[model samples]
Target: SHMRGPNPTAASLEASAGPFTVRSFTVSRPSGYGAGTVYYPTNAGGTVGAIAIVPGYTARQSSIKWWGPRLASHGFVVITIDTNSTLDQPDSRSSQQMAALRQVASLNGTSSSPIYGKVDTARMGVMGWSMGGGGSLISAANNPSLKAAAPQAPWHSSTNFSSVTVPTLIFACENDSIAPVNSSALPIYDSMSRNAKQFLEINGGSHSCANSGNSNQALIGKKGVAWMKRFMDNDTRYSTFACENPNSTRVSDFRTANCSL
Candidate 1:
């Protein structure tokens, strides 16, 4: 059931679009302090692919609500999870986020669990922003089950992110003060393994580019959706569209082409 709170903010979308069956909704996973929330969607045909999202520090799942609906609109199952503590327990909370994602995957993937029948666990991906970006990076690097990732405005140094083995799409905002794109994401791009893929820049955006608060947020969301379709759905055509779509007008606020990671 969807949880409601006094200060509740929400993310929502259509149940169907194009060739995709969009089951967009929100659910709160029980955490130690309170129920953690996640905004997500599942494909109609017993799950085509799955993505787990990690929201940044001090953010609720609703902050990145744009991703779930946008990804759903494009035919990929996506979920953005809220998991953090005031104590700044990133080390411990990161593990909790991964475990919570596995729980979601088991239901929707090929894990032979109850919900597994509906989900394609074999093609799982993760995406995170800010502190959660760092957390997703750690999980992708260490968790053999994670196949790909897209981290937006990740924290710490780029060198700290160099060793990840998963295919990743890194988004670095041009005007970010918290984690500068050139100093952080660019260097991480330099260090990633040979298989790592894609680096994008959101023009005229700030550290808050990862969440939906302005038109720039929508621009970034569109690019992220296209990337999820290409990599997670295993769609070669959409992959081409994502990488080579010449319509720069679509993502003008957040210009994105693609580059080798």
Candidate 2:
């Protein structure tokens, strides 16, 4: 029953997003592995949009952990699923999470769940990190419900971005060895249909920086959260926060970033 009120720092964005509230809850697994947790945020009263977070290739739900609090603070109900059995095995987890959300959206009048309360199904979004990023792209490329998407350090698989018409954003890190700056992020940005948005590069931050664990995560996290708020939450004032400005600011050691504006 905890609600994080409006973020004073982002107060300027209130005109578009209104008041923000972030909350968390656990859902019953019936007879599955264990009880899972979900973090959600509301703008004022009604639902604005929902974001599904997918972790990186070898990462677990914990990778997208910071997203919960950050996005929640912006009035987004972020659903973080424990994909597969482990952190790297997100394929199975991705499928299960997507299916469950779809079912919940279909059967219920509102997005209110036994765990999280009423969710606005109309304005929906999806985001993924690494492997989950690929899954998110796959889902969006196929499903019509997704209005917007952001794939962080994408693990773009066989799924092509040639057909995706959704407003998509990619968060790429300069120090990342896995999804390097040249091939992965750039190519995807290039191939994405006209409707897709370009990628933002974060300078000096490592792969861990994008996750919840790193000390410098908040630096990149601040931008990521604001990005989702602008597009996914339908907040126009925050739109300028989407692209990265590599030349302007100085970053920390744990941070490895290089952004595109």
Candidate 3:
């Protein structure tokens, strides 16, 4: 399917919403993991890829809440979740992510579910911020079935994750105070040896640089959506957006390996 979900072109990225109306609802502790907020494209023409987004430590769904509406409006089903406990570690967060995806799969074909038949469980993605970003990496490394992953300002105790086979996009903050890019994002992106990967660093971004209400949405948001669409949806049309070097002043550093579709 060459169709690029709701808004396919560059012009629409600046719009507040996509071609389809976005709708969302809260899901209480499903599958005994965590509570989540589900966002999907209302009246979308067909089933679409889905993504499970987790927030960093001590953070709730609101911390990474922007991704829900942003990704859903562009034609992907998005779920922003609050871990069973705010203090859960990266590994624990990774477990919760898979649980959320499982719940999403169960929602499909269910008679009372709004997402009935609307979720393509086979083509799924995961994303998160900080420790949650590290959890995203853990989730991908542990689940080879995941189609894609995008981690922002990731932080993890271990830097060796060469086992991660899923396509990944690492959003790094150049001046992060909490999780330094050199020790966290850079090393994680370097450890992946056998999959399509990319690392994009904001010139002066901080630990919370790419969260709910970031100022660089035009640049960061566009690249993020492109990465997920390219991998999770297998849409070749987004290849350029995902692989091309931005060469913009906003980007302090950029790296890629096998990003071509």
Among these predictions, the greatest TM-score belongs to 3
**Per-candidate TM-score against the hidden true structure:** 0.75, 0.75, 0.96
Off by over 4 Å in 3: none
lDDT of 3 by residue, 86-176 (tens): 8999999999888888888888767788899998778889999998999999999999999999999999889898999999999999999
Q: Report lDDT (Cα) of residue 213, candidate 2.
A: 60
Order of models, best TM-score first = 3, 1, 2
How large an RMSD does model 2 have?
Answer: 6.0
**Whole-model lDDT, candidate 2?**
0.58
* lDDT of model 2, residue 239: 49
In the predicted model 1, the residue pairs found to clash are: 107-115, 107-116, 108-119, 109-119, 109-121, 110-121
For model 1, residues 1-261, the per-residue Cα lDDT tens digits are 111111111112111123444454444444332233333344344455667776776776766666766665554556666664633444444575576666666445435433445556677777777777776677777775576688888774334655666777777776888888767766766667545366666667688766766555444554565566556665544454346433444332233323321
Model 2 ranges with Cα > 4 A deviation: 1-21, 30-36, 87-94, 103-117, 215-219, 243-247, 250-261
Give each model's whole-structure lDDT: 0.58, 0.58, 0.87
- Candidate 2 — number of clashing residue pairs? 16
For the record, the alpha-carbon RMSD of candidate 3 to the native fold, in angstroms, is: 1.5
Every model: Cα RMSD to truth: 7.8, 6.0, 1.5
| Strongest candidate by lDDT | 3
